[PDB]
């Protein structure tokens, strides 16, 4: 499990090993985009940032906790 | 014929809460039928329509559905209903939902007879509704008491018993409890078998070695609790003497 995907952009599937508000704090400044933590009931926790920066989202997910980079399959869309 | 209003009289009372069905919108608001009271049209005005500001109208009314609202004024002379959607308490919305569902169940129940025996639905419902709604509460509790012990249908004579027999034919709660065995005795399985033989002769089953889960099919919601505590105390009495200890939480 623990699958993660990015859909035009929301990130569905996020490990809980670090606090969410600091993730938002680093995200907004390193992307320069509006950031939302939307907690829909019992779906993959929603973190939404504007623009088409999936390469930059890759950079962020590498720089936050990511060390696998193999279960990430971003849908183009 | 879906007719013959659920409650005592055809014409709604004052300041009463309803749920309504939408059919059309001319230009001002919508005069739409009601499935909480008699099917006389009740009209909603746009001033009393949307808690949010009026910019889209087809998404908040959703023509052809059920919506909670409250009737302000009623015209019982020739039939006009002034109906309001906004001033409804967030806790009374649940009241409207449950009352509408209860009336829907009553409508569903007293249609089977009218269609099986092709007699007037209005006549049969008029005969049945005197002990039904006005006794001390809704019909569903009376119907459940009657299926467990028939006493409500006999309050007044129906047109016949074949229709009531069809009702009974169509109509024809589990409580959980956990018991954890903390036994350190040598022979403690025989005590469990004996106690469960005594208790079962309602449904007690197994999950784990110390865990015994009883799911009693109670009929009164309070008889099940007392049988549950009786079984628990029987377990404790049997098990605290032969050498072991058990606990229930």
């Amino acid at each position: 499990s623990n699958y993660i995907h990015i859909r035009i952009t929301t990130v569905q599937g996020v490990p809980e090993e670090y606090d969410l508000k600091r993730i938002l704090k680093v995200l907004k400044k390193d992307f320069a985009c509006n950031g939302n933590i939307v907690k829909d009931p019992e779906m993959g926790e929603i973190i939404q940032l504007q623009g088409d920066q999936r390469a930059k989202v890759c950079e962020f997910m590498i720089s936050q906790l990511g060390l696998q980079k193999k279960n990430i399959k971003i849908h183009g869309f | 014929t879906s007719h013959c209003r659920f409650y005592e009289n055809k014409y709604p009372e004052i300041d009463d809460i309803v749920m309504v069905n939408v059919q059309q919108i001319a230009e001002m608001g919508a005069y739409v039928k009601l499935l909480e009271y008699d099917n006389i049209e009740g009209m909603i005005l746009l001033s009393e329509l949307s808690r949010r500001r009026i910019r889209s109208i087809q998404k908040l009314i959703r023509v052809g559905k059920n919506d909670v609202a409250v009737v302000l004024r009623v015209d019982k002379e020739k039939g006009y209903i002034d109906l309001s959607k906004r001033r409804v308490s967030s806790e009374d919305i649940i009241k409207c939902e449950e009352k509408y569902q209860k009336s829907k169940t009553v409508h569903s129940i007293l249609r089977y007879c009218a269609e099986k025996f092709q007699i007037p639905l209005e006549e049969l419902y008029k005969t049945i509704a005197w002990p039904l709604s006005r006794k001390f509460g809704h019909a569903y509790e009376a119907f459940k008491l009657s299926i467990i012990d028939e006493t409500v249908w006999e309050g007044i004579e129906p047109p016949s018993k074949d229709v009531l027999d069809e009702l009974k034919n169509y109509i024809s709660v589990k409580i959980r409890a956990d018991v954890e065995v903390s036994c350190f005795s040598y022979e403690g399985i025989d005590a469990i078998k004996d106690a469960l033989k005594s208790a079962e002769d309602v449904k007690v089953k197994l999950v784990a070695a110390p865990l015994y889960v009883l799911t009693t099919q109670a009929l009164d919601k309070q008889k099940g609790i007392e049988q549950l505590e009786s079984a628990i105390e029987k377990i404790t009495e049997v098990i605290t003497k032969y050498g072991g200890v058990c606990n229930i939480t």
Binding site: - | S182, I189, D190, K193, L196, E200, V207, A209, P210, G244
Partner: protein
């Protein structure tokens, strides 16, 4: 039933469960939803068939080509023991249980595999010397690589306690050259003297909780446990006591009566010792639910096992540490250090009160029973988990 106990040891990610499956045929469950892929916790079990054809998996032989079938010769049990660093106490329990050994050595990996050598030392600790070296990987080697590995195994194992170790090629997938394994097991490994002379005892190594869920409780089975007998035959209709018992820190004995004795396929009234047997008694299944009946010394009524807390032990340590590819010298014991002292099968870390160069006094938190010898193993806390340092024996 089973006549002699046999076990298999190997390094991690080496392959022994499927090897025994190709030897015996009984699936290793490897349950609890996390043991399926990393390591196991409870012991694996299997049963082998030995009908030897003297002109095999089945009592009737058709594969050799001649319609002659095989006759009953031996039926040996197999106790799969996990060779990993995390768990050692159950490894030592099974090691005291087993009588015959099968060691795995991996070719292309590092020829000294630390767990293989560590468990070979454990084998040599508890009077096990009939060991057959098995090359667990054969297809994955060249001929020259196989020759190099043969010479490496020979040069590495020359002067150890286990000197006469025949070598056998096996795999987990092919299922061939298997009759050689059975032949060498029958030949090199005899059944140790086990007859009616010595008084009966039992050693229980596992706990089975038998309570069929969903079924009506009015008819349930009691508590069944896996046990090994180093002396005497157990018969139905006897009163038995689980001596390490229950905690009321202090412990007190458990008494019970035998209900059934599952013997390798069914319930047999008598059972010659030397094999794992399922003793099903009136004991409470909760006492058999968790890892409770793991390493408990059990007595037939008519004997009085002695419960001890202070134990005087003759112990000896080897020169170097075991189980590491850095290594350090063996250091002499220091007072007030909790050291695990496994009395054949028990799992209880004792405190050291008296220190001598070849003698010691140790106090167990949980008291344990002592009957005659009950050989022991000694493990310390050095490499962030339990590391073998030597062997121990009760002397009082």
């Amino acid at each position: 039933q089973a006549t002699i106990n046999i076990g298999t040891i190997g390094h991690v990610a080496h392959g022994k469960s499927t090897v025994v499956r190709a030897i015996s045929g009984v699936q290793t469950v490897r349950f609890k939803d996390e043991l399926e892929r990393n390591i196991t916790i409870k012991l694996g079990y299997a049963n082998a068939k030995i009908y030897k054809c003297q002109e095999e998996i089945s009592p009737k032989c058709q594969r050799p080509g001649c319609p002659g079938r095989y006759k009953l010769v031996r039926h040996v049990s197999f106790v799969d023991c996990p060779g990993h660093d995390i768990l050692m106490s159950t490894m030592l329990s099974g090691a005291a249980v087993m009588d015959a050994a099968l060691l795995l050595i991996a070719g292309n990996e590092s020829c000294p595999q630390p767990q293989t050598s560590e468990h070979l030392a454990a084998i040599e600790i508890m009077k096990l010397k009939h060991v057959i070296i098995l090359q667990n990987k054969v297809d994955l080697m060249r001929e020259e690589s196989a020759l190099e590995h043969q010479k490496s195994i020979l040069k590495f194992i020359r002067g150890t306690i286990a000197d006469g170790a025949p070598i056998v090629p096996i795999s987990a997938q092919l299922k061939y050259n298997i009759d050689a394994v059975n032949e060498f097991i029958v030949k090199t490994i005899p059944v140790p003297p086990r007859d009616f002379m010595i008084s009966p005892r039992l050693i229980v190594i596992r706990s089975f909780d038998v309570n069929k869920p969903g079924a009506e409780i009015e008819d349930l089975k009691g508590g069944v446990a896996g046990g090994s007998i180093l002396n005497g035959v157990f018969k139905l209709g006897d009163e038995i006591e689980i001596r390490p018992g229950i905690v009321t820190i202090q412990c007190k004995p458990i008494f019970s009566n035998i209900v059934s004795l599952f013997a390798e396929q069914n319930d047999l009234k008598f059972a010659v010792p030397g094999g794992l047997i399922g003793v099903g008694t009136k004991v409470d299944p909760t006492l058999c639910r968790a890892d409770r009946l793991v390493g408990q010394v059990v007595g037939a009524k008519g004997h009085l096992p002695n419960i001890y807390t202070d134990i005087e032990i003759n112990y000896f340590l080897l020169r170097r540490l075991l189980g590491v590819k850095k290594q350090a010298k063996v250091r002499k014991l220091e007072p007030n250090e909790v050291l695990m002292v496994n009395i054949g099968s028990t799992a209880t870390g004792a405190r050291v009160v008296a220190v001598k160069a070849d003698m010691a006094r140790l106090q167990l938190t949980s008291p344990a029973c002592t009957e005659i010898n009950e050989k022991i193993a000694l493990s310390r806390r050095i490499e962030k988990h339990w590391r073998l340092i030597g062997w121990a024996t009760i002397k009082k």
